[PDB]
Amino acid sequence: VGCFDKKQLTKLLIHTLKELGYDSAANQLLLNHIQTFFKLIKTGQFHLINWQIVCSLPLAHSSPLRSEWLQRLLIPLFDHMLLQLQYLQQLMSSVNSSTCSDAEIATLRNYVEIMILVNRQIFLEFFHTALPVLYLRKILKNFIEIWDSLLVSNDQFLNEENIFNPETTLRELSTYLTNPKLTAQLNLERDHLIDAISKYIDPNELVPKGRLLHLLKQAIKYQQSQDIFNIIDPDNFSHDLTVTFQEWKTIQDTTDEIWFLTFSPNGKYLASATITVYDVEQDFKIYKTCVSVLYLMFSPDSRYLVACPFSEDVTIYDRVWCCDAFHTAERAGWMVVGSPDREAIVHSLTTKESLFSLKGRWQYVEDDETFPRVHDVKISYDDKYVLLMTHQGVIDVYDFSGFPIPRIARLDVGKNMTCISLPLNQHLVLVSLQDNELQMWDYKENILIQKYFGQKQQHFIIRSCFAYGNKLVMSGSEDGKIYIWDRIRGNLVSVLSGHSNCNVVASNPADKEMFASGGDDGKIKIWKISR
Amino acid sequence: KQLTKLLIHTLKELGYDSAANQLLLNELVPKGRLLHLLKQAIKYQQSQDIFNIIDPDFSSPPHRINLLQDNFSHDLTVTFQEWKTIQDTTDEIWFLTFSPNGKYLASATSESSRGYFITVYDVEQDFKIYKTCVSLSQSVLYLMFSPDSRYLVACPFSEDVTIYDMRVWCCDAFHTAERAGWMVVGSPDREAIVHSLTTKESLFSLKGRTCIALGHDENISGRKSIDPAKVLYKPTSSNGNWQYVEDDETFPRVHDVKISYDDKYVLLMTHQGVIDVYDFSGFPSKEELSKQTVDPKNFLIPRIARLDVGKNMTCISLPLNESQHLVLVSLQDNELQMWDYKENILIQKYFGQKQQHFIIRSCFAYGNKLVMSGSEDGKIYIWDRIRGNLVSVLSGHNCNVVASNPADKEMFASGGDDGKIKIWKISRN
Amino acid sequence: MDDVDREFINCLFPSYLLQQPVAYDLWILYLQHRKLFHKLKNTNLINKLTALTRKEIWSKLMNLGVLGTISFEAVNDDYLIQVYKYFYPDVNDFTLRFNSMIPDIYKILGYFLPSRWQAQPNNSLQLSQDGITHLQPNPDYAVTWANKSLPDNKLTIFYYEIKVLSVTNSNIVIGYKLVENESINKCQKYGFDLNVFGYCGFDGLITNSEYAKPFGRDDVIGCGINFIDGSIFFTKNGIHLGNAFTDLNDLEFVPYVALRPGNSIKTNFGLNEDFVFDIIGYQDKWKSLAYEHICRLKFLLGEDNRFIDGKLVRPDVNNINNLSVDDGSLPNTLNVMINDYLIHEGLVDVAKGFLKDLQKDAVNESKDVIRHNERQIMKEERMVKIRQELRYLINKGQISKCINYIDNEIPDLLKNNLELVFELKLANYLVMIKKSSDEIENLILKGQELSNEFIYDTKIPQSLRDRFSGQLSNVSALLAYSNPLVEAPKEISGYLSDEYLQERLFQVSNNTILTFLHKDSECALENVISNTRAMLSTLLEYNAFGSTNSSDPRYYKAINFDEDVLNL
Amino acid sequence: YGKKCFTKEEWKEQVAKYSAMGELYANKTIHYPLKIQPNGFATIQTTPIEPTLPRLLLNYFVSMAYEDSSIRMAKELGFIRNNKDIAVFNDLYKIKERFHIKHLIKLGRINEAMEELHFKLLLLNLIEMIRSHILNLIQYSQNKLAIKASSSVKKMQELELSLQNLYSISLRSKIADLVNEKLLKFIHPRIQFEISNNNSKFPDLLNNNYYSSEFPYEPRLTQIMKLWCWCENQLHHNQIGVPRVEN
């Protein structure tokens, strides 16, 4: 059938039809070991689980046991598990001869782990007096010790997160004993055990839970991978068309260049830094002129503009080089100032009443060196993180727990940096650089996700940003072209040319489909997407 | 729950009518839908892999399909196998070139036994020597094969040119038939020439017959300094006017010449670190110059673009037969760039080889899938083209020349200081 | 120290260096990674499915750039390992998982001293995969130095030895080099720059200058630096030559070798093989010299008379503490101080014996001390009986009666001192657990009752509530065994030791009783010992002047307090 | 005074950064304070104060020839069991005889002590004879000193003989202490042998290098106090300031 295997297709169909809830169709289309073990677990008669009802499972990685150990392991509810442990104990004295090809032990370890999981479920079922101790001590300390021996006699354990598992398991089990509340707050039903056991089994013999849905989602991803302008987000098709980029409105307001642009957090105003504010919902009629400035911001209420001049201190409309406001309603109305003088003092829109100035403010360490010299700041949307530029090509991230100070991480990049452009509403950040590149970092885990190539940027200052939700990433360039990359994949989707360098690009955080670009030719243009 | 209707339809389709009928208790979905969605998902899973290198050519049964867990490879899906070693008369090797028809190999030795003679090996007859050439003893430097796959052109170090049958350090030939048997020569004396390799009188010089930069596109850029007329070579263009300004500067030393496959674009290296591209799209045809009295040297040629990269270049290469206006450039400081010359765009950067103090080549291979280069070690570096990540580092020596086969798709030769000429075959895909 | 940690640390670090005052931070270094080495002592530590080194390897490869426009998600681990093998061939399959036949694990421990020769960026040299076993300057198209640079204000003596085993009088220039680096051109042309203190081998003449004879085919040459008086010396074949340099304190150095392309060497920094020069026999000489130089009303001392609200104005005088044996003030102060310590904690019988004995020894200043001492021993008589009773109760293992006694005598203490009653009740529980050997049906009830008392009351603060749980879990982990004093691990069995219970309940309780009644709890003797041990470290931290100017011996670098003075 | 000037809290923090082992390491969740407020906000440390003083106390008691205190401190440490080990311990360091000799020499009755260096003891005997208020003196001096006069020039200078120091008690106590140190040095090897092969229970309370040849045979606490005063004064010579010890 096609190029797949007919038997696999039939088995997948049967499991899917069963999983949907239907019974007769699946039970009729027929014309096990894992199944009977899972039934034993589900109904619950653990006293019937002998060794050979476990050793018969088709382990995911390796081949079954050699037909010498299973003989000693099949010589034939506290007494049942004690008997199983006694049967196991002799295999260690037999294997003391140390004749193993680094794989027989690699299977015995899995079997011991499955048995310990079942015993752990048995133990935790006692909390839902003097019986748990007699159970734990013998019938679990012996298994834990044996498992630790088997694990130690391998050249396979990761030093980090594979070597202390028996110790931490026994510690947790023993501390649950004189503290029963944790047993209640545990979510210890009889299906997570089946989940873990299934994780231990071969995945091409036990059909993974919900596979056809997974493959359908993958096929939808493949279809979406043909056109990157869509709303679908996980019958016939959802692709095979074409789209385009069209500019439609221009503003030849003056002959001077443009340093900075910004769009209202509600998509109803356009700022400029030639200060002018344009209405955007009324066919771009000049709203007002406010009276050099090199940075703009809007309040989260989309009411108050905040300039950031060159030498004068600040200005607000109904040295300092950057400013970013918070978002949380609890701490709303508060904002953060920057300065190329190693200073950063929280502040607000009362033109006074300063606050924490960080110019000298699971483990902790002593204070480090000084002179941060911030350039650009960003505030996480959950207001729980503050991102600061430096001039030596590093970023600092600070944690803000509650006002009504440590640093979580220091991201190193090397070359000189530029705009930061926090993603639009995991954790991400889009740092622009010289050396003709863009980087998509990750400030939570301090790792570089990926790079973007192809925009001329040397000895100047250019701007980049997100667009079209968080699906496209665009930037300016030295040659007057706008560059537009796909974000998930990282290929050059489009290179438009509408300036003759282009400095700034911005978007509505209110309209999915349009943006604006401004350059040094004395122009401001509005672009939109045709289908 | 639209899934239910599709499942019933496919169950009835495959052959279990009774099961579908028992199950029975938005436009009439077509025949074989799941057998298509599963193929789409399999293609996506293959795409998400990293080891797959797509052979340029569904019906693969080799127990390598399983729709129960995600399927992916572990080793690289392709393999490189050394096959031969032509290590006779190991003095020094500098340059290798195959033929367009893939029936000969040409190697440029250095002063070993019979002068600075070069060698041409057969390929079918077990790589036996087909012709050892007699050359003026000056350690010849550049080689080229005519598009007719017959003529061989050799450019030495000491101001001469040799043509063989079956200072100028830059040779290339035209591929289109409309201008047959014409070649372009580039020299470090700031000279570019059009030449015919059977009569060899001259056809057209350069260094003084080029209008700089073509000014602008439809005069939008303005940039008025000095404006000549429309006496520039141009057909009935529908893209814009490209004969705007006749600015000038000192002609730059040329260290490599390339010609596109439509005779429409010639790329010239410089010494300072810049590439410049010209377009003989209006150059007189062979038939229109054989009889008509149209004459160059009272004319000029436009310049489409000027690719600025920085450091000093070493070699440029072109693909064989995502856009098709690509070029691969080598340069010092341990890098390898890819550019779109007809657009002035940087596509991709390749790192890993050790490139300093020498002259090291590079090329495409496996049709277009791989990009290989030498280095200052004995190693050979092979990258994936589309994404630019290492795929292999073989050992073949320092090694300073590589070349692929433009006719066999599966073989390529190497060459290093120690004279070994290794042949490698690419298999398993 | 146990019977395994001593052996492991001896196997790890060089012998002569554990006898310096810089053994303390080395022991801390080892102690930070005790359990891991305990586990790993099984196998796979005698001469890949990454888990969390994934991100570090990814970053270290993307630093070079051999990965282009490829997302962090959806990366095949084996692909990363394969590409890593091309640029880090010597990776010994252990870093991915992350006498002494132990490979280079000192990267984990952060061992801050040189261990191997490091390879230059060029290929004009080749070292046998260790930087120690075999260094040879391979045929041309040769200088190098050690990886780390030893500090100056953290140790006393350093010494390493090389063995020449190939010849072109050999032609190797070895020694120390001042560090302002990652000046090399002249080092590669000649055998030394203007800042390379080295012992040549052409003739033997010291660099930058008839010093000694040349070495040859098979010779062992060691280069030792002595920070006590700022000297650099060389030795050959175990015979100490003369000291080569002088007056070199307050600098920074690194081992350095320049080798001609005809000779090969095998280095040794003392980690694996022992030396031949007997560096210990050189170090103890200087230790004895330092000891010789250092140790060859009125008696009662009050607060320092130079303190004004955190301001220490220093009267311009010769010295601050004029106590001398010849005058006799030192024995007087020592006697009053020792009696104060004795009557501070029990042992009042020994104090009375001391008073009697120094009443007998004196013959017709040395009686004012006796009179004051008698007044002191007779005034504080009520607290001494309480202390002795407390000692008897704690040593008898009757902690409940101890609580009854403490509440009985001092009325208003326990009602608002919860952080002490917890430390007492937990010890009572531990005593019950230790004694029980079918009370196991009652241990559980007792533990649950006291946990519910000290955890789920929520009138207590948050940090205290969180802290009262860790101790309870730790003591609970004891029940899983049957003979916890032997089967249990080191710490959990440490809870049951005589030390913890008997010598810590008393230490906490006595000081609590004293500090509640508004009396100082410092004995002014262990204060003296701790102050001395801290003063030695604070002198070592700041390179200090010895006697007059910073060119004489600095003798505080040889006083290893604990192992040489505090242990008989 | 501007090098590293300290404050009470800062110096306390600097001191506290030792983390003494105390044989209860590997249990890093034990060392924390108490913060006992009432009586107000105080602090008490749970780490052992100094886990080695009770041996230095015994060393001081034994080496100063203090008998009763030695016996009591040996009792309160775990070395004594009965009324026979008392005798063998009192004969192991022969405390009583050393104390009697030292007390006699300090008292000035040189001859009685002598009936059990030597030149200095004879010099003190001659000083006593002169302080008593001759042919017999001539014969005495001639024999017992010309047998030892021709040794150096220092001895002659000493024999020639400030005014209130020659007759003081310090000159009668310094030589007593020095002879006590000499008897300790003489006695020490036998304790080593006895505890080594004769399988004793008591330990060795005393340990051309000066350290190994003259350092142990002296009260160890006195050496520690010497070093303490030396270090406290050495900090002052480099303008570094630290707080002193209060009482």
Coordinates of C-alpha atoms in Angstrom, one line a residue, chain A residues 340-513:
Chain A
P340 CA 25.7 56.9 28.8
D341 CA 27.1 57.7 32.2
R342 CA 26.7 54.4 34.1
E343 CA 23.4 55.3 35.7
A344 CA 19.8 53.9 35.6
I345 CA 17.2 55.3 37.9
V346 CA 13.6 54.2 37.9
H347 CA 11.2 57.2 37.6
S348 CA 7.7 58.2 36.5
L349 CA 5.7 61.0 34.8
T350 CA 5.7 63.3 37.8
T351 CA 8.9 65.1 36.7
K352 CA 10.3 64.4 40.1
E353 CA 10.3 61.8 42.9
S354 CA 13.1 59.5 41.9
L355 CA 13.4 55.9 42.9
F356 CA 15.9 53.0 42.9
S357 CA 19.1 54.1 41.1
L358 CA 21.1 51.0 40.3
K359 CA 24.4 52.9 39.8
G360 CA 25.9 51.0 42.7
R361 CA 23.1 49.0 44.1
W362 CA 19.6 29.9 44.6
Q363 CA 22.9 31.4 45.5
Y364 CA 24.4 34.9 45.9
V365 CA 27.8 36.5 45.3
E366 CA 29.6 39.7 46.2
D367 CA 29.4 42.9 44.1
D368 CA 31.2 43.0 40.8
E369 CA 33.0 45.8 39.0
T370 CA 31.4 49.0 37.8
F371 CA 30.7 51.5 34.9
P372 CA 27.8 49.7 33.1
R373 CA 27.1 52.7 30.7
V374 CA 23.7 51.6 29.4
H375 CA 22.6 52.5 25.9
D376 CA 19.2 50.9 25.3
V377 CA 16.7 49.4 27.7
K378 CA 13.8 46.9 27.4
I379 CA 11.2 45.7 29.8
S380 CA 9.6 42.3 29.7
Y381 CA 5.9 42.3 29.2
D382 CA 5.4 40.4 32.5
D383 CA 7.5 43.2 34.0
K384 CA 9.7 40.6 35.6
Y385 CA 12.8 41.3 33.6
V386 CA 14.8 44.4 32.7
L387 CA 17.3 44.2 29.7
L388 CA 20.2 46.7 29.5
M389 CA 22.7 47.3 26.7
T390 CA 26.3 48.1 27.3
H391 CA 29.0 49.5 25.0
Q392 CA 31.5 46.6 25.3
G393 CA 29.0 44.3 23.5
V394 CA 27.2 42.7 26.4
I395 CA 23.6 42.7 27.7
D396 CA 22.6 42.5 31.3
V397 CA 19.3 41.1 32.6
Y398 CA 17.9 42.1 36.0
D399 CA 15.1 40.5 37.9
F400 CA 12.4 42.7 39.6
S401 CA 10.5 40.7 42.2
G402 CA 8.6 43.4 44.0
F403 CA 9.1 47.1 45.0
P404 CA 5.6 47.6 46.6
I405 CA 19.5 43.9 43.3
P406 CA 20.8 40.9 41.5
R407 CA 21.5 40.1 37.8
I408 CA 20.2 36.8 36.4
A409 CA 22.4 36.7 33.4
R410 CA 25.0 38.5 31.2
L411 CA 24.8 37.8 27.5
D412 CA 28.0 38.2 25.6
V413 CA 28.1 38.8 21.8
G414 CA 31.4 40.4 21.0
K415 CA 30.9 43.0 18.2
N416 CA 29.3 46.3 18.8
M417 CA 25.5 46.3 19.2
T418 CA 22.4 48.3 18.3
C419 CA 18.6 48.1 18.7
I420 CA 17.2 45.3 20.8
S421 CA 13.5 45.1 19.8
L422 CA 11.9 42.8 22.3
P423 CA 9.3 40.5 20.6
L424 CA 5.8 41.6 20.1
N425 CA 2.7 40.6 22.1
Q426 CA 9.2 31.3 25.7
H427 CA 11.5 34.3 25.8
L428 CA 13.3 35.9 22.9
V429 CA 15.2 39.0 21.9
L430 CA 16.5 40.4 18.5
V431 CA 19.8 42.1 18.8
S432 CA 21.1 44.0 15.8
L433 CA 24.8 44.3 15.2
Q434 CA 27.6 45.6 13.0
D435 CA 29.5 43.1 11.0
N436 CA 26.4 42.6 8.8
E437 CA 24.3 40.2 10.9
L438 CA 21.4 39.9 13.3
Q439 CA 21.1 37.6 16.3
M440 CA 18.1 36.0 17.9
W441 CA 19.2 35.5 21.5
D442 CA 17.4 34.0 24.6
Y443 CA 17.9 36.0 27.8
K444 CA 16.2 33.4 30.0
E445 CA 18.7 30.6 29.3
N446 CA 21.6 32.6 27.9
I447 CA 22.0 31.0 24.5
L448 CA 22.1 32.1 20.9
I449 CA 19.2 30.6 18.9
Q450 CA 20.1 31.6 15.4
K451 CA 21.6 34.3 13.0
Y452 CA 20.3 36.3 10.1
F453 CA 22.5 37.4 7.2
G454 CA 22.5 39.9 4.4
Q455 CA 22.2 43.6 5.4
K456 CA 25.0 46.1 5.0
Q457 CA 25.7 47.7 8.4
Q458 CA 29.1 49.2 9.2
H459 CA 30.0 52.4 11.2
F460 CA 26.4 53.6 11.4
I461 CA 23.2 53.0 13.3
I462 CA 20.2 51.1 11.9
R463 CA 17.0 49.6 13.2
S464 CA 15.3 46.2 13.1
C465 CA 12.0 44.9 14.4
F466 CA 9.4 42.1 14.3
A467 CA 6.3 42.1 12.0
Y468 CA 3.3 40.1 11.0
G469 CA 2.7 38.8 14.4
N470 CA 6.0 37.3 15.3
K471 CA 6.4 35.5 12.0
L472 CA 8.6 38.0 10.0
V473 CA 11.7 39.9 11.0
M474 CA 12.7 43.0 9.1
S475 CA 15.6 45.5 9.2
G476 CA 17.0 48.5 7.5
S477 CA 20.3 48.7 5.6
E478 CA 23.1 51.0 4.4
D479 CA 22.0 50.6 0.8
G480 CA 18.5 52.0 0.9
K481 CA 16.7 48.6 0.8
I482 CA 14.4 47.0 3.4
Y483 CA 15.3 43.4 4.3
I484 CA 12.6 41.0 5.3
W485 CA 13.5 37.5 6.7
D486 CA 11.3 34.6 7.7
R487 CA 11.7 34.0 11.4
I488 CA 11.2 30.3 12.0
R489 CA 13.4 29.2 9.1
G490 CA 15.8 32.1 8.5
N491 CA 15.8 32.7 4.7
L492 CA 15.6 36.0 2.8
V493 CA 11.9 36.3 2.0
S494 CA 12.1 39.8 0.4
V495 CA 14.4 42.7 -0.3
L496 CA 12.4 45.9 -1.1
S497 CA 13.9 49.2 -2.3
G498 CA 12.2 52.4 -1.4
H499 CA 14.9 54.9 -0.4
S500 CA 17.5 56.8 -2.4
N501 CA 20.5 54.7 3.9
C502 CA 17.1 53.6 5.5
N503 CA 17.1 54.1 9.2
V504 CA 14.0 52.9 11.0
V505 CA 11.1 50.5 10.6
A506 CA 8.0 50.1 12.8
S507 CA 4.7 48.3 12.9
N508 CA 1.2 48.5 14.5
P509 CA 0.9 46.5 17.6
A510 CA -2.8 46.7 16.6
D511 CA -3.0 45.7 12.9
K512 CA -1.6 42.4 11.9
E513 CA -0.9 43.5 8.3

